[PDB]
Amino acid sequence: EFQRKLYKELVKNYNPLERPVANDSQPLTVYFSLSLLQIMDVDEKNQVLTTNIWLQMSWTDHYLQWNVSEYPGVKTVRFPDGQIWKPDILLYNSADERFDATFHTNVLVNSSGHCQYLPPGIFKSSCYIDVRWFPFDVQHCKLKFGSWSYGGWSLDLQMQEADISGYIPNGEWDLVGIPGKRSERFYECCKEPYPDVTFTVTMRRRTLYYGLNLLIPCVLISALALLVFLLPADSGEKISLGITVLLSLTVFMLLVAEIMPATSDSVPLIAQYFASTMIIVGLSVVVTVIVLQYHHHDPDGGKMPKWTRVILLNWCAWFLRMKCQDESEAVCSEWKFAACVVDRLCLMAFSVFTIICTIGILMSAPNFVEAVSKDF
Amino acid sequence: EFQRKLYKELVKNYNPLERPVANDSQPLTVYFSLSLLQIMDVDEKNQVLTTNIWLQMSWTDHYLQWNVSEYPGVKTVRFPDGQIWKPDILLYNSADERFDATFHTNVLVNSSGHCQYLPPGIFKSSCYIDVRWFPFDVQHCKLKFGSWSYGGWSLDLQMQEADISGYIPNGEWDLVGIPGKRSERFYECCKEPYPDVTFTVTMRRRTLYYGLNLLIPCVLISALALLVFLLPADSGEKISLGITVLLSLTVFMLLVAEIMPATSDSVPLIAQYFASTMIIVGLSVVVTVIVLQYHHHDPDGGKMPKWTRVILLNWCAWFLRMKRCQDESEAVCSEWKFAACVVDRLCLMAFSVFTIICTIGILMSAPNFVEAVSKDF
Amino acid sequence: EFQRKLYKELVKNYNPLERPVANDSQPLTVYFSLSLLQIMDVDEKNQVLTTNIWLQMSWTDHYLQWNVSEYPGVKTVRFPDGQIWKPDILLYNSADERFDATFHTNVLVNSSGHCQYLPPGIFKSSCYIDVRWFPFDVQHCKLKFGSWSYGGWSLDLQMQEADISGYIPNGEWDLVGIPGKRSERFYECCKEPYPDVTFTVTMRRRTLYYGLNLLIPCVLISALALLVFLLPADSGEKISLGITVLLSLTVFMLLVAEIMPATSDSVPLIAQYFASTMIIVGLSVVVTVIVLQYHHHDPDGGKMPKWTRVILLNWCAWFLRMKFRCQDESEAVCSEWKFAACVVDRLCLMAFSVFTIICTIGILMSAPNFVEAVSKDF
Amino acid sequence: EFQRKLYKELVKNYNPLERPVANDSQPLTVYFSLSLLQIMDVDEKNQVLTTNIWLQMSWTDHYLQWNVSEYPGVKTVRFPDGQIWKPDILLYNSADERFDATFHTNVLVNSSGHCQYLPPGIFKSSCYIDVRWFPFDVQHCKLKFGSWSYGGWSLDLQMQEADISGYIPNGEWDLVGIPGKRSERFYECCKEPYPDVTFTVTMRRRTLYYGLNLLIPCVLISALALLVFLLPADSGEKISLGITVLLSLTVFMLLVAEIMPATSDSVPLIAQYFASTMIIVGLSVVVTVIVLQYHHHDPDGGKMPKWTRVILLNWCAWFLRMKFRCQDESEAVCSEWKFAACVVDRLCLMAFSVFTIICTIGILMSAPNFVEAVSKDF
Amino acid sequence: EFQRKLYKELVKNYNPLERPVANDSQPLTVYFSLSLLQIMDVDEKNQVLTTNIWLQMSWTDHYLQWNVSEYPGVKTVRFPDGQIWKPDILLYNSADERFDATFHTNVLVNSSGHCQYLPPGIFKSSCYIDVRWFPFDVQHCKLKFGSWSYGGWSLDLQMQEADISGYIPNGEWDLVGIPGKRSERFYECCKEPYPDVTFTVTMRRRTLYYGLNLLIPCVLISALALLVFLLPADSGEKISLGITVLLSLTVFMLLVAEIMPATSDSVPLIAQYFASTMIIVGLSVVVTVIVLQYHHHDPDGGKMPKWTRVILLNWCAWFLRMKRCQDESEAVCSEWKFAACVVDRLCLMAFSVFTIICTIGILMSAPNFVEAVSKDF
Ligand SMILES: *[C@@H]1O[C@H](CO)[C@@H](O[C@@H]2O[C@H](CO)[C@@H](O)[C@H](O)[C@H]2NC(C)=O)[C@H](O)[C@H]1NC(C)=O
Ligand SMILES: *[C@@H]1O[C@H](CO)[C@@H](O[C@@H]2O[C@H](CO)[C@@H](O)[C@H](O)[C@H]2NC(C)=O)[C@H](O)[C@H]1NC(C)=O
Ligand SMILES: *[C@@H]1O[C@H](CO)[C@@H](O[C@@H]2O[C@H](CO)[C@@H](O)[C@H](O)[C@H]2NC(C)=O)[C@H](O)[C@H]1NC(C)=O
Ligand SMILES: COc1cc(OC)c(NC(=O)Nc2cc(C)on2)cc1Cl
Ligand SMILES: COc1cc(OC)c(NC(=O)Nc2cc(C)on2)cc1Cl
Ligand SMILES: COc1cc(OC)c(NC(=O)Nc2cc(C)on2)cc1Cl
Ligand SMILES: Clc1ccc([C@H]2C[C@@H]3CC[C@H]2N3)cn1
Ligand SMILES: [Ca+2]
């Protein structure tokens, strides 16, 4: 009864186009915030952020005010889309094909006129993904909200603190905070300024997944390449093993390309690590070819260079604690012994290069210590 | 004739925004329940569940009532979307881009006023998929339903037991049940509490499919890797079998990556088993290098360390029941080759024992393993 | 002049909510059928069927009746969606995200009130795909249609024979028929019964494409695997060829997995055949290591067990028609070992050849529709 | 001042359902045509064609007529969807999920009543893609247009010659023409005839892209397969090279599988080329194993059959212009056996070179459109 | 108060179909422009350009004029889609499935009637992507805008300079400018001419990403292929190394195929470079077979043709500074291996030079190479 009567009275002469102020000259205060429920996906290749968001827009309709003593029990009303004035707060940097992914729901008003509007939505935002440090990367993705067609003299946008009470963790991202800021900006279209609210979603990538799936396997497959320097040359599989492992590491670079965006702002840390390891494996291929040339040397070819006969069979040989047809066998054994010395020297040197480059590149990430401590 | 008169009478002064109650102060009892017709696809990369649900919302419209003695033969009327007050019971954890996968259908009513509204839809829900024990894992997926803008004082939501009579099996998931629960929660937006009905769809993965596409194949490829220890070394193909088989085993991890989500909450059992297999095969390659180093040992090189000369050619050799300058060099080479043969067999047995243990000990660490294997096969 | 008058006259007091009967108590007969124009795709992985369908729903509106003598030349009228009552017959087992893929068009009524409504649509239906017999599979995909909110006491649904005259073939699927059936089922929501019309689209997969792109290439590549027993061991490439072929046959399994659903209701025939082929090639590599192990046996090692010396160098040798001094003796003992290694190649050449022939033939002819397949599409 | 009055005047008693004819009995002449702007993609796997089309429907509304002397300066008016009667001309064989991809725009009327309506749209049409001759194929894709609910007695559809002046080239397809035809067919639903206008888009695939991406690389990888007969046997990599190149060729059959539809109407030409190439390389591996069997032949076994000793070491050896004591005698027999490996290598090198040449030319020039193709695209 | 009065007054007799001019005979000037905020995606395979655009359409409504002295504080009004006449300026060369990706927003009018309309949108346009010079390529994508149904005699379209102040860089594309041009074209449909405004978005591709993912790795993998000529033949892995690296170079051609459109207008520079690389590696395999044929020459076979005995063992050998029956047989076999080694060394220089030329020569055959190398590295 009273609900029917009140609904009939509240729509007499009501125009959903009129801004609901008592004094037309004064701006209308709109309190804006959001509740972030989940970060569903961050597809870095297209530079878009998908979030489950409950935007919270509250304002006051001067006309939707009733005296509850005259409408007993009726303390709130609800109006669907198109029947009540609403703030046209859009996401400026939207990436959704429709550009406005908000789902239009009811506006709950009470007896005093305070309007509460809590549209749910899946919002896609064009976020610049700083991939410099991936997988140890921290992203600051902005969600910029503002009235599309109302300036400061008409819609006085005000900020309320973001809600994360109902947030459900993701698995891949540690929300470090959603600090917000209210700005008063001027635009090259118009003279009246337009205020905006920008929420900076700060998220730290949890590195266990990519860590176990890319870094640890890469390290140990690069380690399978370093076994070539312990394999004997007579096996006739040095080049096979070495080249096969190198061409196997290409799969990791392919996967990164499937994940990463095609941006030239910087070179990804994962990319530098894959590049450094794979170039070192290629150098292992070059050096084993040299070992095989020393090993398979025609005895009646060139003589042993004195430089080599001392730099390998005297110094390096001692450092590592190694130590007519039959004269040629001695000669070839000497050439084969030189091949053995090169194997051990480069084994040690390439082992250290692997150790340094791996540790040196990974600790250049600011977030490395935080990462290893929180995620392992 | 009477249908026209009824439809004309029932819309007079009707407002689709007025809760259809007689006493405004009392909440309106709405009964809610769903019907899971099919689980078409549970997405595990985007942590999204997909279902073919037919919701059920029954209430009582105080305004849409008539005396059948006046309107012969019109015992029921139907109203489309936007003409009758309808409960705004949305899914809270929706993953659909429109957020509302409900298809708006008619609202049947009878001569007493009891509305009945069953909307169909392909509901997508953001469900946390516990992948810790995958493929032997019970996902527990919540579908939380509630009126978006009505609190407890206005819409008294009540739960009815879920219907699964028409449920159509899936093939991949054995529905273990869909228990529901009614909650009264408070929100940081508002003071009036809001009740919600949450249906937890509990799903058991049928493991035969993965069983034969990934795990048993991986076991057999790992045995194929294990064959390197039976190859004679003179073939010159030990390392090519080892490394080639390892590279073939990498596709299984690629597949599991293509299915799994990029989550750090846990390490899937499939991942731990695949990783242990990869580590065992890589260690087989390292040991392959060691055996080839012993086999190709220069006769005029280092001497056999007594620790080796006993630990390999005396104890391990007996346990397994094995037993001129060029001739002496061949004799040393012949010894070293015996050491190469002994290492192959010891590591054959040892890697055989680690394969059976690791596989059984990782797979039988899943609580649902027995239920699964006993029923899925 | 008269079409305008008729259109104005027919909407006087008309309500698109009223079911158009003269006697409210009697149900309204609705004749339901469809014209199947094309089966666009059957994505078996998702268990969905995409079809081009022109549902044919005809009924009688009591109120849309005029006397053509008073409206000369105006013999039919047309009304768009939302202006006249039309039966809300949906596809119950729909798999489309919107759940209702029907495209709403006009309703052609004539002077006697008979309404004809033939909406086109791209329909996705959740069809259980029996993948046991793939590629030689026959599917029975159900399209279940019924009025959502009208029971038998209100809308007397009647079936008309399915139309396939204008059906345009697909390329992969042989429509075996679209037999229909009217059923009266009870539901756990309600007491009034609900009738439905179920069209079972029966489809035979045309086997030439997959059979050329999966089955035959596996046969020939697996035959290449069994050929290792003609390669000599001294080549030093038996293991390379054998393992390379086995690892190459895995890509077919990747494609088969990319196509098929993730179901445990039964094991597909394509998979049992590939698995049986794959294990035979794997066993061939197992035999390969044994051949190279008997060959590369230390001449001064263990002696040939008499049991081996007979099973290989005496009996099997006849059936298949085969037939410094320390170094010479060492070559001699090694020489019998090489021949023993050679006999295993030939025995296992014959034996594994038979396994593939039996395995392949015995698994393929266990499909009921196999003879139809080879006879119709080859 | 006058545009407001005209718009106010023209909507008095106007009903957008009424066909705008003066005599209801006479059909309404509608002139239909289209402007083809671009062929964005034809995804043959799903058998659908994506085109940018601006359909051109022009007719005469009897009611939207004004005298320009009374409304000076107001010479044309525009009406959006739902306010003016429009022809419901749909694409019968549509493959779009919505089934109607036309974008609804204004209807430009002038003072004489002639309505001009040019809705743009991206149209998906279910087109039969003849993949028999691919990549040297020509397609005939139908765009079938007709009034959905108006027959010949009410809407007399008429064809106008299609416009391609503004056509934007594609890159992959040479528009050979869009000849149209008006047909009047009877349907199994209804008695009143229905006219339709069918545009057969004739498209020739430009073969430079696939000819360099698939044909030439396959030729060259098959040439590396033929190189096995020039490798010495002692290298121990003949089988490695041959099998490696075969598994390299497998990706091309994967690529066509990703491109081509899974239809069994025929075997695509590219598939027939790849199949013949793979068979030739596999047979080359077979012969490679036979040569290795001859090369690694023990000299204590069987003696060389006379047939072999002539067919290889006498005739074929002459035509192609090649030409401790126990160890030497065995080396002589081993040397004789190794010579046989060289003869087979050389004979089969020439023979497998020729069958690649024949197979290549005989399959490529079996397409009628091949010569025109190579002449236009290379 | 005054806002509601003004809204009531402005909608009396207003028709959103009427073009809002005082004199019907004179065309209505509409100023058109756009603000390009981002180039979201260039999927060249579909020949489509995805951009974030805020089209700017400004005109004057003759009827939406009020005196602010009579409506104090009410200086602007806003009207949603369907309530006021708007210019139907569409993107002619649209590739979006709905064909109109504009998001309909309010039209901000002031007291003098000037209407300001700035709709946002994700715009897909069918743009011819000249892949001739890829990755060092510059694209000129046209966005053609015009009123669909209003010709020059009714809607006098005028262009305003494009806004890029708020443009946010992309990462892969350097916006070189968006020059516009206003045209008056005649169409085969109609007699009244129709003006359009065409914005040519000019984009220079950033080459660091592709430079480091495909060009440099291809060079280094082809160099790895060139190592075959330093490998000794007795290793028995020349053919293995060469052929394996060639199948590895095929992934790059597959990647380019995944990227590039299916166009025959020209051959992309990347494709020509990869093709030359593949020909060099394949010719290296062919000559590798020849050297192995030289090395595995039966000593009792043919004799060395004098041509060979000079061109390899005298000139080329000196240029590169190289220098009983079984004894004779090994001696002749020793020369064949020496001939085999000489061919390897010549091929090392020659194929190195071919590698040097093709790589350097083909890459600077792109006009934009210097611009790229200077800006992108
Ligand atoms: C209508 O709702 C508004 C907002 O929820 C109420 O205003 C709040 O009242 C509480 C009670 O003292 C204050 O603590 C808040 O600061 C107020 N907020 C605002 C924005 O005004 C208002 O009281 C409600 N009206 C009635 C009649 O209860
Ligand atoms: C209106 O259309 C209906 C259906 O097309 C017509 O009913 C059919 O008429 C034919 C002609 O004799 C009969 O053979 C069929 O059996 C009728 N069908 C049914 C279901 O009764 C009807 O005659 C048409 N009315 C007019 C005035 O032409
Ligand atoms: C309504 O807005 C228009 C444009 O925003 C105003 O016209 C501009 O006025 C300024 C100041 O005189 C000039 O510099 C511009 O050149 C004008 N632009 C155009 C397109 O004419 C107009 O003055 C505003 N109306 C009122 C009442 O202030
Ligand atoms: C391509 O090659 C690989 C790819 C991989 O995934 C993307 C992984 N992944 C992996 O090792 N994941 C693990 C290990 C453990 C323990 O837990 N997760 C490995 C290889 Cl080799
Ligand atoms: C890549 O390598 C494999 C991949 C596989 O799928 C993902 C399978 N799958 C498999 O064998 N599936 C079967 C077997 C039987 C019987 O039924 N289904 C095997 C390998 Cl080796
Ligand atoms: C992975 O390896 C293959 C894959 C293939 O496709 C998926 C095919 N396909 C094929 O042979 N298709 C043919 C042959 C003829 C004649 O016609 N179509 C072959 C191989 Cl080897
Ligand atoms: Cl009603 C009508 C009349 C004309 C047009 C056309 C004229 C120009 C070119 C395409 C479009 N704009 C489109 N619609
Ligand atoms: Ca991500």
- Which of E172, E206, E240 terminates a domain? The answer is E206
In angstroms, how far is CA A214 from the centroid of its own chain?
A: 15
Cα–Cα dist A39/D362, whole Å: 59
Side-chain-side CA neighbours of residue B230 (13 Å): 17
| Helix (H) or strand (E) run with residue B139 in it | strand B138-147
CA-based diameter of chain C, in Å?
125
Contact between residue A316 and residue A345 where contact means Cβ atoms under 8 Å apart: yes
Contact call for D73 and E24, based on CB within 8 A:
yes
CB count, 10 Å around CB of A371?
Answer: 23
Q: Which atom of ligand 6 is nearest to the CA of D267?
A: 17
What angle separates helix C269-295 from helix C325-364, to the nearest 10 degrees?
A: 170
How many beta carbons lie within 10 A of that of residue A40, not counting itself? 16
Burial of B165 (0-12, 13-18, 19+ CB in 10 A): exposed
Whether B213 and B302 map to the same domain: the answer is yes
Residues B253 and B182 occupy one common structural domain: no
- Rounded CA separation B5/A369 (Å): 77
Q: What is the 3-state secondary structure (H, E, C) of chain D?
A: CHHHHHHHHHCCCCCCCCCCCCCCCCCEEEEEEEEEEEEEEEECCCCEEEEEEEEEEEEECCCCCCCCCCCCCCCEEEECCCCCCCCCEEECCECCCCCCCECCCCEEEECCCEEEECCEEEEEEECCCCCCCCCCCEEEEEEEEEECCCCCCCEEEEECCCECCCCCCCCCEEEEECCEEEEEECCCCCCCCEEEEEEEEEEEECCHHHHHHHHHHHHHHHHHHHHHHCCCHHHCCHHHHHHHHHHHHHHHHHHHHHHCCCCCCCCCHHHHHHHHHHHHHHHHHHHHHHHHHHHCCCCCCCCCCHHHHHHHHHHHHHHCCCCCHHHHHHHHHHHHHHHHHHHHHHHHHHHHHHHHHHHHHHHHCCCCCHHHHHHHHC
- Greatest Cα-to-Cα distance within chain A, rounded to the nearest angstrom: 124
Cβ atoms within 10 Å of A188's Cβ, excluding its own: 10
Touching E: D residues 172-191, CB under 8 Å: 172
Assess contact for B59 and B90: CB atoms under 8 A: no
User: Any CB–CB contact under 8 A between D293 and chain C?
Assistant: yes
**Contact C319/C349 with Cβ under 8 angstroms?**
no
Is residue C259 within 8 A of residue C44, CB to CB? The reply is: yes
Q: Measured between alpha carbons, how far is C36 from E89 in angstroms, rounded to an integer?
A: 40
Instruction: Indicate the SS3 state at residue A283.
Output: helix
Mention every residue, 6+ apart, whose C-beta is less than 8 A from residue C122. Answer: C40, C50, C51, C52, C101, D95, D96, D97, D99
**Placement of tokens 């410094």 in the chain:** C324
In this structure, what token pair is assigned to residue A70? 């005259």
Classify each residue of E155-169 as buried b or exposed e, where b means 16 or more C-beta atoms within 10 Å of its C-beta: bbbebeebbeebbee
Residues 6+ apart with CB under 8 A from D112: D60, D65
CA A211 to chain centre: 14
- Cα–Cα distance for residue pair E245/D224, rounded to 1 Å: 14
Quote the minimal CA–CA distance from C139 to chain B in Å: 16
* Same domain for E255 and E183: no
What would the two tokens of residue C150 be? Answer: 């009208």
Cα distance between residue A273 and residue A268, in whole Å: 9
Gaps in chain D with C–N over 2.5 Å, residue before each: 323
Beta strand extents in C206-364 (DSSP E only): none
* Cα of B321 vs its chain's centroid, Å: 49
Contacts of E369 (CB under 8 A, 6+ apart): E136, E363
Atom of ligand 6 nearest to the CA of D276: 16
Residues A205 and A134 sit within 8 Å (Cβ to Cβ): yes
Q: How far is it, in rounded angstroms, from Cα A193 to Cα A190?
A: 7
Q: In this structure, which ligand is nearest to the CA of B210?
A: 5
Closest CA to B95 of A306, A135, A168: A168
Tokens found for residue A208: 């266990």
Question: CA torsion angle for A237, A243, A248, A254 (degrees, to 10)?
Answer: -170
User: In this structure, what are the phi and psi dihedrals at residue D27, rounded to the nearest 5 degrees?
Assistant: -70, 160
Q: Is E29 on the interface with A (CB under 8 A)?
A: no
Residues with CB under 6 A from ligand 1: A 110-112, 114
Closest chain A residue to B299, measured at CA? A333
Chain B residues within an 8 Å CB radius of C126: 38, 40, 52, 168
Listed residues D206, D236, D255: the one ending a domain? D206
**Ligand nearest to the CA of residue C65, numbered in listed order:** 2
Specify whether C216 is located in the same domain as C152. no
Say whether both E153 and E113 belong to one domain. yes
* Cross-chain Cβ contact B231/C292 below 8 Å: yes
Name the packing angle between helices E238-259 and D216-226 (round to 10°). 170
User: Which residues are registered as beta bridge partners of A146?
Assistant: A90, A196
Do both E201 and E213 map to the same domain? Answer: no
Mention every residue, 6+ apart, whose C-beta is less than 8 A from residue C303.
Answer: none
**Locus of tokens 């997405």:** B43
CA distances, E307 to each of C213, D34, E290, E313 (Å): 51, 72, 16, 10
Nearest to D99 by CA among C98, E126, E95, C174: C98
Answer for the pair B157, B195: CB distance below 8 angstroms, yes or no.
Answer: yes
Rg of chain E's alpha carbons, rounded to an integer?
A: 34
The Cα–Cα gap between C191 and C151 comes to 9
Nearest 5°: phi and psi at B346? -55, -45
The DSSP output letter for B161 is P
Residue B80: exposure state from Cβ atoms within 10 A (0-12, 13-18, ≥19): middle
How many whole angstroms separate alpha carbon E213 and alpha carbon E208?
8
Mutate to test the pocket of ligand 3, among E64, E112, E160 (most ligand atoms within 8 A of CB): E112
Binding residues of E for Ca(2+): 19, 21, 149, 187
Tokens representing residue D145 in the block: 């247009």
Query: E281 to chain A: which residues are within 8 Å by CB?
Result: none
Nearest chain A alpha carbon to E230: A289
**Top mutation candidate among A216, A244, A270 for ligand 4, by most atoms within 8 Å of CB:** A216
Q: Assess whether D261 and D299 both reside in one domain.
A: yes
Q: Is A131 annotated as a binding residue?
A: no
User: Mutation test of the interface with chain D: which of C2, C3, C10, C238, choosing the one with the most D Cβ atoms within 10 A?
Assistant: C3
Q: Which of C190, C206, C222 is the last residue of a domain?
A: C206
**Is D167 known as a binding-site position?**
no
Which residues have their alpha-adjacent CB atom under 5 A from ion ligand 8? A 42
Q: Which two tokens stand for residue E6?
A: 């003004």
Q: How deeply is E85 buried, as exposed, middle or buried, from its count of CB atoms within 10 A (0-12, 13-18, 19+)? A: buried
Q: How far is the CA of E162 from the centre of ligand 3 (A)?
A: 20
Place of tokens 């029966």: C202
| Residues D38 and D167 sit within 8 Å (Cβ to Cβ) | yes
Angle at B195 between CA B191 and CA B196, to 5 degrees: 135
Say whether both E78 and E149 belong to one domain: yes
Q: What is the DSSP letter of E235?
A: G
Q: Which chains touch A (3 or more CB pairs under 8 A)?
A: B, E
Residue-by-residue DSSP string for C332-350:
HHHHHHHHHHHHHHHHHHH
Residue C165 CB-half CA count within 13 A: 6
- Angle made by CA atoms B307, B313, B314, in degrees to the nearest 5: 85
Q: Which stretches of chain C are assigned E, i.e. beta strand?
A: 28-43, 48-60, 76-79, 89-91, 107-110, 114-117, 120-126, 138-147, 155-159, 173-177, 180-185, 194-205
Ligand 3 atom at minimal distance to the Cα of residue E110:
1
Could you check whether the bond before residue A135 is cis, i.e. omega within 30 degrees of 0? yes
Q: C87 C-alpha to center of ligand 2: Å?
A: 20
What are residue A204's DSSP bridge partners? Answer: A138, A174
> Exposure pattern of E130-140 as b/e (b: 16+ CB <10 Å)?
bbebbbbbbbe
State the Cα–Cα distance between residues A2 and A72, nearest whole angstrom: 7
Distance CA C354, CA C346 (A): 12
Mutate to test the pocket of ligand 5, among B209, B212, B216, B274 (most ligand atoms within 8 A of CB): B212
CA nearest neighbour of B301 among B271, B340, B336: B336
Q: How far, in Å, CA of B121 to CA of C97, rounded? A: 7
A125 touches chain B (CB under 8 A): no
Are A32 and A102 in contact by the 8 Å Cβ rule? The answer is no
Q: Do the chains contact at B278 and A217, CB–CB below 8 Å?
A: yes
What one-character-per-residue DSSP string does C80-99 give? -TTTS----EEETTB-STTS
Query: Tokens 């079996």 correspond to what residue?
Result: D366
Comparing CA positions, the residue from B320, B325, B323, B344 lying closest to residue B335 is B323
Residue C64 contacts residue C76 (beta carbons within 8 Å): no
Residues of chain B in contact with residue A161, where contact means CB-CB under 8 angstroms, are none
- For residue C134, give Cα distances in angstroms to C129, E29, E151: 10, 66, 60
**Within an 8 Å CB–CB cutoff, is residue A376 touching chain B?**
no
> How many independent structural domains does chain D possess?
2
Contact between chains at E15 and D38 (C-beta distance less than 8 A): no
Host domain of residue B339: 209-376
Which phi and psi (to 5°) does residue D365 adopt?
A: -85, 0
**Experimental technique used to determine this entry:** cryo-EM
Half-sphere exposure of B305 (CA within 13 A, CB side): 4
Coil, helix or strand at residue B144:
strand
Question: How far is residue C339's CA from residue C313's CA, in Å, rounded to a whole number?
Answer: 8
Buried b (16+ CB within 10 A) or exposed e, C171-183: bbbbeeebebeee
Q: Please answer whether residues C99 and B120 qualify as being in contact, where contact means their C-beta atoms are separated by less than 8 angstroms.
A: yes
**Are E272 and E186 members of one domain?**
no
| Chain E residues 297-316 with CB within 8 Å of chain D | 298, 300
Integer-rounded Cα radius of gyration of chain A: 34
Task: Provide the CB-side half-sphere exposure for A98 (13 A, CA).
Answer: 10
Q: In this complex, do E264 and D171 lie within 8 Å of one another by their Cβ atoms?
A: yes
A-contacting residues of B 137-156, CB under 8 Å? Answer: 148-150, 154
- A46 pairs with which residues across the strands? none
Asked if residues C264 and C271 have their Cβ atoms less than 8 Å apart, the reply is no
Nearest Cβ partner for E19 among D3, D207, D251: D3
Q: Does B271 touch chain C (CB under 8 A)?
A: no
For residues A56 and D173, give the distance between their C-alpha atoms in angstroms, rounded to a whole number: 52
Determine which of D61, D256, D289, D303 to mutate to test the interface with C (most C C-beta atoms within 10 Å). Answer: D289
Residue C189 with chain B: CB contacts under 8 Å: 56, 116, 118, 163
The DSSP annotation for C36-86 comes to EEEEEEEETTTTEEEEEEEEEEEEE-SSS---TTTSTT--EEEE-TTTS--
Which residue of B206, B209, B210, B213 sits with most ligand 5 atoms within 8 Å of its CB, as the best mutation to test the pocket? B213
Q: Does E243 touch chain D (CB under 8 A)?
A: yes
Length of chain D: 378
How far is Cα E134 from Cα E259, in angstroms, rounded to an integer?
Answer: 11
Burial of A95 (0-12, 13-18, 19+ CB in 10 A): buried
Residue A40's Cβ-side half-sphere holds a number of Cα atoms within 13 Å equal to: 25
Task: Looking at the CA of residue C110, tell me the nearest atom of ligand 2.
Answer: 1
Give the integer Cα–Cα distance in Å for D311 and C226: 28
> Atom 5 (ligand 7): residue with closest C-alpha?
E149
Name the residue type at position B301. G
Q: Tell me, what DSSP letter sits at residue E266?
A: -
Closest CA to D97 of D118, D126, D70, D76: D126
D196 and D231 in a single domain? The answer is no
CATH of residue E79's domain is 2.70.170.10
Look at residues A119, A81, A125 and name the one whose alpha carbon lies nearest to residue A99: A125
Distance to chain A for B375, nearest Cα, Å: 31
Q: Are both A174 and A238 inside the same structural domain?
A: no
Residues in chain B within 8 Å Cβ distance of A120: 90, 94, 99, 148
Ligand 2 neighbour C52 (Cβ under 6 A): no
Do residues D46 and D155 both lie within one domain?
A: yes
- Say which DSSP state B54 is in: E
Query: C267, B212: Cβ pair inside 8 Å?
Result: yes
Indicate the burial class of A302 (C-beta count within 10 angstroms; 0-12, 13-18, 19 or more). exposed
What distance in Å separates the CA atoms of residue E49 and residue E44, rounded to the nearest whole number? 8
Other residues' Cβ atoms within 10 Å of the Cβ of residue E255: 17
**D108 close contact with E: CB closer than 8 A:** yes
Sequence-ordered list of residues with C-beta below 8 angstroms from that of E205, at least 6 positions apart, any chain: E134, E135, E136, E137, E138, E139, E172, E173, E174
Question: Measured in angstroms, how far is the CA atom of residue C68 from the centroid of ligand 2?
Answer: 15
Q: State the Cα–Cα distance between residues B147 and B57, nearest whole angstrom.
A: 11
Beta carbons within 8 Å of A369's beta carbon, 6+ residues apart: none
Contact status of E52 with chain A (Cβ, < 8 Å): yes
Name the residue among B202, B186, B196 with its Cα closest to residue B32: B196
DSSP-derived secondary structure for B247-295? HHHHHHHHHHHHHS-S--S---HHHHHHHHHHHHHHHHHHHHHHHHHHH
Distance CA A30, CA E52 (A): 27
Resolution (A): 3.3
Q: Are residues B260 and B44 in contact, defined by beta-carbon separation less than 8 angstroms? A: yes
The answer, for A253 touching chain B at a CB cutoff of 8 Å, is no
Cβ(E269)–Cβ(E213) under 8 Å? no
Q: Say how many CB pairs under 8 Å bridge D and E.
A: 161
Instruction: Looking at E296-315, list the stretches that DSSP marks H as alpha helix, in order from N- to C-terminal side.
Output: 306-310
* A355: Cα separation from own chain's centroid: 26
Nearest 5°: the CA angle A180, A182, A185 is 135
